[PDB]
Structure formats: C-alpha cells, structure tokens
Amino acid sequence: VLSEGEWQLVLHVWAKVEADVAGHGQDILIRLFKSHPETLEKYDRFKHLKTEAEMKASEDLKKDGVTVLTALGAILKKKGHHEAELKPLAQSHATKHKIPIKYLEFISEAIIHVLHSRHPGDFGADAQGAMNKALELFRKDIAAKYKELGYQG
Ligand code: HEM
C-alpha cells in the first residue's frame, strides 16, 4: 500500500501522460516491442510490423496504446482500490489473450523508460519509486486474479 505522497507523485506524472495519451502509448508499445520482441507476437493485429516507422504509422497500434493507457490510468487513479477495474482485465488477459505476468513486467519497464525519457523533471528517484510500487501492486493483484481464473496456477 503506497503512501498518499507516493500516490500523488504517480498521479502527477500521469497528468503529463494525459496531455498526449496516444503519443505516449505509441512510445511505450514501440519500446516494449524493441526490448522484448516476443511480445509483439500476441498482437496478431501487429505482429507483421517490422520498422519503427511502420509502428508509428499504424492506426491500430496507436489505438491500442490509448486502450492500454486509458485502462491503466483509471487503475492508478483508484490508488490501489482497483478490484473492479482489474476484474475484466484479468478475465480477458488470463483467458483470452494469455498474457503472462512477465509480459506485464516488460510493459511496466517500457512505461518507466518512456516516462523517464519524456518527463525527467517529474520522474526523479522519488517518483520512479512510487510508480514502481504502483505497477508492482497492479501486477501482484492481477496475478492473484489470474490464479483465481485458473491461469498460471
Ligand atoms: C498495463 C498493462 C495492460 C493494460 C492496462 C491492458 C489493457 C487492455 C485493454 C483495456 C484491452 C481491451 C479490452 C480487453 O480485451 O481486455 C486490452 C486488449 C489486449 N491486450 Fe492488453 N493491457 C496491458 C498489457 C498487455 C500486454 C503486456 C500484452 C501483450 C504482450 C497485452 C495484449 C493484449 C491483446 C493481444 C489485446 C487484444 C488486442 C486486439 O484486439 O488486437 N496487453 N488490453
């Protein structure tokens, strides 16, 4: 459970993301795919994209990045009180998309990289630590759900 201060650092940098949710989403998904190319394979929709420029030009990828960040933003705003938001996400990601926790780690890493790249002044050690805790909590709670649904374990 994060402190209120930590939550406020998370939400402070997130407001920056909200200024251009699509461009942030693009940067994060591109980062994910560059750093962990195996992930691009569960997006049957994108899995054919080969260059950075192709990724930037893809409407579908741009849409997807907004979908991810919109959901995650709503989650972070709940300050850990996010059971109702995680429920449908766990369902689809455990039972349909089959996204292992390690991939959620990979996308967490990409979020952290992009937020530090674009907003370093709002993403010092203090804020990085808070975001890391928030994303860890999301992972921890979604993993418990996954198991309830019969995934992983
Ligand atoms: C912060 C992490 C994530 C959030 C908040 C998130 C959220 C979403 C939401 C809201 C949707 C659409 C509704 C639904 O199907 O549940 C979705 C779809 C999907 N997501 Fe995620 N997601 C994340 C991580 C991932 C990761 C890491 C992968 C793969 C490596 C992934 C792959 C999938 C796929 C394949 C779809 C369906 C896309 C399509 O229609 O072509 N997600 N996600």
SS3 string, the chain, reads CCCHHHHHHHHHHHHHHHCCHHHHHHHHHHHHHHHCHHHHHHCCCCCCCCCHHHHHHCHHHHHHHHHHHHHHHHHHHCCCCCHHHHHHHHHHHHHCCCCCHHHHHHHHHHHHHHHHHHCHHHCCHHHHHHHHHHHHHHHHHHHHHHHHCCCCC
Domain ranges of the chain: 1-153
**Residue nearest atom 22 of ligand 1, based on CA coordinates:** 68
C-beta of 139 in contact with ligand 1 (< 6 A): no
Q: Is the CB of 47 under 6 A from ligand 1?
A: no
Nearest-atom index, ligand 1, CA of 64: 38
CB 12 within 8 A of CB 27: no
Q: What angle do CA 144, 21, 8 make, to 5 degrees?
A: 60
Resolution in A: 1.6
Instruction: Name, in order, each residue with C-beta under 8 angstroms of 84's C-beta and a sequence gap of 6 or more.
Output: none
Tokens of 62: 């741009």
In angstroms, rounded to a whole number, what is the distance separating the alpha carbons of residues 91 and 149? Answer: 7
Euclidean distance between CA atoms 117 and 26, whole angstroms: 14
Q: Which atom of ligand 1 is nearest to the CA of 135?
A: 1
Pick the CATH number of 1-153 from 3.40.50.300, 3.30.360.10, 1.10.490.10, 1.10.357.10: 1.10.490.10
Distance between CA atoms of residues 72 and 117, nearest Å:
19
